[PDB]
Amino acid sequence: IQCSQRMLSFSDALLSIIATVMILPVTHTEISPEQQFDRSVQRLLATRIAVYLMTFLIVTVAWAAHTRLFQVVGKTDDTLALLNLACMMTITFLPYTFSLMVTFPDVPLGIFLFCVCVIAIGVVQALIVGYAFHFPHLLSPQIQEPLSKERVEAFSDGVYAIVATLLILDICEDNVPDPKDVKERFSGSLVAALSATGPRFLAYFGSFATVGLLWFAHHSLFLHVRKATRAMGLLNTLSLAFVGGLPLAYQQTSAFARQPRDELERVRVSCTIIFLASIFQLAMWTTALLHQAETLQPSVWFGGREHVLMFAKLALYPCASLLAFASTCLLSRFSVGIFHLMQIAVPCAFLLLRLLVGLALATLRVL
Amino acid sequence: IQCSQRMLSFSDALLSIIATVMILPVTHTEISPEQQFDRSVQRLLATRIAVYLMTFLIVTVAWAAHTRLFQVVGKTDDTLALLNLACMMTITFLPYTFSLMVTFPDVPLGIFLFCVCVIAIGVVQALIVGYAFHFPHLLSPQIQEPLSKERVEAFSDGVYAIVATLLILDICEDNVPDPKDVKERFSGSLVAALSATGPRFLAYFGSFATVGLLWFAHHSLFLHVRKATRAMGLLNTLSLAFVGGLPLAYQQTSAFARQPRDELERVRVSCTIIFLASIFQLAMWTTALLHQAETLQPSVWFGGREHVLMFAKLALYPCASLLAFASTCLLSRFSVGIFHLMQIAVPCAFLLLRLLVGLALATLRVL
Numbered sequence: 001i002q003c004s005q006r007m008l009s010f011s012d013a014l015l016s017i018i019a020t021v022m023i024l025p026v027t028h029t030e031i032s033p034e035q036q037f038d039r040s041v042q043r044l045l046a047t048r049i050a051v052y053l054m055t056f057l058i059v060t061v062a063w064a065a066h067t068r069l070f071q072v073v074g075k076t077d078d079t080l081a082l083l084n085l086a087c088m089m090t091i092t093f094l095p096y097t098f099s100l101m102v103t104f105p106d107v108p109l110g111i112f113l114f115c116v117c118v119i120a121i122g123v124v125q126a127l128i129v130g131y132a133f134h135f136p137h138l139l140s141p142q143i144q145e146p147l148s149k150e151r152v153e154a155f156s157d158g159v160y161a162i163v164a165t166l167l168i169l170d171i172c173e174d175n176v177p178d179p180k181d182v183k184e185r186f187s188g189s190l191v192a193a194l195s196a197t198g199p200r201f202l203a204y205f206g207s208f209a210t211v212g213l214l215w216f217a218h219h220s221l222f223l224h225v226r227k228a229t230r231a232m233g234l235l236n237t238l239s240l241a242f243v244g245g246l247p248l249a250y251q252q253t254s255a256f257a258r259q260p261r262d263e264l265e266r267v268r269v270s271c272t273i274i275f276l277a278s279i280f281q282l283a284m285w286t287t288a289l290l291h292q293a294e295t296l297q298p299s300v301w302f303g304g305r306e307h308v309l310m311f312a313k314l315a316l317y318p319c320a321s322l323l324a325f326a327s328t329c330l331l332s333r334f335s336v337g338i339f340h341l342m343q344i345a346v347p348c349a350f351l352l353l354r355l356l357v358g359l360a361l362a363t364l365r366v367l
Numbered sequence: 368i369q370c371s372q373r374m375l376s377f378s379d380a381l382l383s384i385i386a387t388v389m390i391l392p393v394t395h396t397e398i399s400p401e402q403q404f405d406r407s408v409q410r411l412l413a414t415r416i417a418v419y420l421m422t423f424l425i426v427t428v429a430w431a432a433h434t435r436l437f438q439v440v441g442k443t444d445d446t447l448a449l450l451n452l453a454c455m456m457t458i459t460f461l462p463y464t465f466s467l468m469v470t471f472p473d474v475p476l477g478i479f480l481f482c483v484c485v486i487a488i489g490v491v492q493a494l495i496v497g498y499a500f501h502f503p504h505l506l507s508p509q510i511q512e513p514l515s516k517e518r519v520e521a522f523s524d525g526v527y528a529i530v531a532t533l534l535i536l537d538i539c540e541d542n543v544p545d546p547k548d549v550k551e552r553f554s555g556s557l558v559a560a561l562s563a564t565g566p567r568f569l570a571y572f573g574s575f576a577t578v579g580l581l582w583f584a585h586h587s588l589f590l591h592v593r594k595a596t597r598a599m600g601l602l603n604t605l606s607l608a609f610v611g612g613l614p615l616a617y618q619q620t621s622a623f624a625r626q627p628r629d630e631l632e633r634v635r636v637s638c639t640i641i642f643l644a645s646i647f648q649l650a651m652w653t654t655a656l657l658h659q660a661e662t663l664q665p666s667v668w669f670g671g672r673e674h675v676l677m678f679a680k681l682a683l684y685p686c687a688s689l690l691a692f693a694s695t696c697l698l699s700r701f702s703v704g705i706f707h708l709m710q711i712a713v714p715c716a717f718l719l720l721r722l723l724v725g726l727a728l729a730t731l732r733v734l
């Protein structure tokens with residue numbers, strides 16, 4: 001009999017990769033220069049994004065079914081670890097089969113293969129449960145609504161890291177200048193060939209900063225959480241799903257726009273994505289406050305030395321994204337600039353959030 | 368003051384992604400049909416593999432410098448977490464700058480940019496240390512040779528998961544049949560279009576199984592480890608570096624070979640890669656046995672109820688890979704088959720290793 005901690009961490013990493021696989025085709029799409037193509041190149045993008053959102057959800061469901069199974073199987077052995085490897089293998093085929101089923105709706109083979117994948121997942125999990133129940137010492141003591149927060153944090157960590165490094169992976173794979181291109185199109189100066197790739201570096205910088213600071217807010221929240229509810233789990237799943245789309249937003253807001261209207265639309269889309277990624281993070285906190293005596297540590301209750309700080313940490317991005325979006329409709333002429341300032345101001349406000357919250361709590365104390 | 372566990376886990380995930388970035392260009396290379404191209408298409412591959420091996424090492428060094436810093440900083444805060452995000456950002460640029468420096472050796476800009484990346488890493492770490500020493504309560508109690516095994520396990524887990532799902536990611540991105548191709552080249556049958564992609568699925572199956580079982584051996588070892596030494600860390604780093612090349616081996620041993628000699632050479636290469644990935648795993652155990660009273664739990668000492676099982680679990684792959692390689696030179700005609708049998712036999716031998724070890728310990732007990 002052995003501890004199951006590391007095996008479940010490995011499973012979480014695999015499940016994060018599998019839930020985020022379908023973001024790569026979305027982010028590998030190109031911006032068409034010919035406007036005649038726009039329509040088509042829009043349609044495809046949408047069809048990809050939808051396939052991502054569904055896929056990330058389906059895998060997440062599997063992840064949940066996993067998390068819950070090994071709350072019934074508290075301890076592992078060699079056979080259980082190997083069968084869990086088998087279950088991970090089966091889960092790894094869900095995205096491909098789902099994409100196949102949606103790409104060929106009329107062909108019956110895709111539905112058949114997706115159903116076979118799901119059935120195989122079920123069979124492997126049944127085998128695990130039967131093995132554990134034939135060796136009762138592998139079952140949890142309570143076996144011999146709640147959701148394990150360790151699994152939640154590991155899954156979220158993996159998703160955040162993938163989304164943060166997505167664009168640097170592409171930069172390393174594709175945008176390393178060729179001596180040939182440097183000798184033909186840039187007159188021999190590698191500085192020029194690298195300057196012609198600056199927009200992609202800007203996109204990666206912005207995306208990494210925003211994703212990492214959203215992870216910072218998530219980490220601050222779950223440091224103060226006692227028990228994670230399935231409601232909080234669904235809210236986190238939605239938040240991560242929308243986090244996945246930040247690299248695309250920053251890749252479009254950094255590429256060239258033929259007309260200013262396009263840049264304004266891009267800013268609006270990016271602000272909407274950030275707001276969606278952050279409002280569900282705030283909703284986790286608000287829902288947890290419904291039953292604070294069980295879900296939160298005493299410090300972050302109504303009347304604690306971390307309640308207001310926590311509220312600020314979770315309400316910063318929603319407010320700033322909403323303000324930028326509003327600027328796109330009220331101060332349009334100064335809107336694109338405001339967004340850029342956000343990218344600098346929001347980090348600083350995190351490095352001084354203690355100070356800013358104290359100042360705001362004193363101002364209203366003298367007003 | 369807050370616990371630093373999750374922040375370090377997030378850092379480990381990021382560092383694993385960054386250390387494995389350069390395996391993608393190796394695995395995205397194609398097999399040339401024209402033999403005249405072979406030479407060139409060989410050279411490029413080598414130049415890629417080298418760049419991988421160096422890169423994985425450099426990042427690993429950074430990882431080590433990280434692991435060690437936050438053994439001096441036992442507890443974290445908001446500022447420290449944000450500065451750690453900055454340090455991760457800086458580490459994330461090392462592969463690109465190193466590839467740039469090796470691609471343009473004569474241009475001085477690449478050396479300059481790589482040095483700037485390293486210098487920035489150093490500056491951020493100095494800032495972290497100064498912050499911790501100006502707030503002594505953030506320093507470890509011993510501050511107010513050994514290597515943290517938690518970090519080692521997290522890093523290894525991430526690398527293993529990435530290498531295991533590498534090929535399924537490509538299958539999802541590229542090898543989903545197009546209705547167009549199905550209507551033009553496969554006569555409308557999606558079953559045929561999918562059968563024309565079977566080799567890639569076979570490669571993924573084999574690679575995932577082998578990587579996961581190597582992870583199983585690693586997990587079994589480190590369940591029985593007390594303190595991890597830097598010698599063991601270097602051995603693990605070498606093992607993971609060679610693990611990274613398993614997808615390429617399985618992608619070449621499953622593609623078409625013009626002549627049988629090519630298939631034999633491919634089998635030899637794959638066996639060599641597996642042997643390298645596994646012999647350093649066994650070397651970790653052998654080195655730990657040098658000082659068993661400190662590095663290992665009492666069960667796996669010389670004279671325990673897990674010593675022989677552990678030896679078998681770590682010596683299975685080296686022996687089987689060596690045996691297959693030998694078959695390539697003694698039973699050449701039956702060599703390619705033997706390798707395939709290995710892919711089935713080695714998993715089964717893990718599901719029955721208790722039984723097999725008992726039988727072998729009784730046989731020699733009556734001989």
Ligand SMILES: [K+]
Nearest residue numbers: 009012154376
């Ligand atoms: K973990």
Ligand SMILES: [K+]
Nearest residue numbers: 021024169536
């Ligand atoms: K990826």
Ligand SMILES: [K+]
Nearest residue numbers: 009376379521
């Ligand atoms: K971890």
Ligand SMILES: [K+]
Nearest residue numbers: 169388391536
């Ligand atoms: K990748």
